[PDB]
Amino acid sequence: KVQLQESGGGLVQVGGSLRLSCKASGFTFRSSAMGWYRRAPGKQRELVASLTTTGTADYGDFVKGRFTISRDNAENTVDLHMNSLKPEDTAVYYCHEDPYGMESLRYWGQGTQVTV
């Protein structure tokens, strides 16, 4: 059964860096997209970063070269290294796995808080 475990959130004040980590438990589908969305309070859920099994990355507009997304398929994990963080980046960050890169099959993590 797919469980998505998130870790690495928490507070760091402006200009800092964090590593969000997400490990996908269960089946390792031959192709999948993994990434992160965020929800700031009262606002609408946004895509932060995503990466397929082939290796292509997709970033939200606001990222602007600040973030790096990597994946270690051996352990079926994905890590987000965030740099130069700012007050606007404070939100709840949710991990997601999309079997075969399809939103209809998406699993969600429970969400991890990041605070500047």
Partner 1 sequence: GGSWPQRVVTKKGRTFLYPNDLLQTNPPESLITALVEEYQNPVSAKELQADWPDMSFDERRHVAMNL
Q: List residues binding partner 1 (CB under 8 A).
A: 1-2, 26-27, 29-31, 99-100, 102, 104-105, 107
Structure tokens at 46: 């946004």
CB-based contacts of 28, cutoff 8 Å, min separation 6: 73, 76
- Which lies closer to partner 1 via its Cβ, residue 20 or residue 24? 24
Q: What whole-number distance in Å separates Cα of residue 114 and Cα of residue 90?
A: 6
Q: How far is the CB of 57 from partner 1 (least distance, A)?
A: 20
CB of 5 or CB of 29, closer to partner 1: 29
| Choice between 29 and 58, CB closer to partner 1 | 29
Name which of 48, 40, 43, 56 is nearest 91 in CA terms: 40
Q: Which is nearer to partner 1, 33 or 82 (CB)?
A: 33
Q: How far is the CB of 27 from partner 1 (least distance, A)?
A: 5
Nearest distance, CB of residue 1 and partner 1, angstroms: 4
For the bound state, the minimum distance from the C-beta of residue 99 to partner 1, rounded and expressed in Å, comes to 7
Cα distance between residue 103 and residue 88, in whole Å: 26
3-state secondary structure of 84: coil
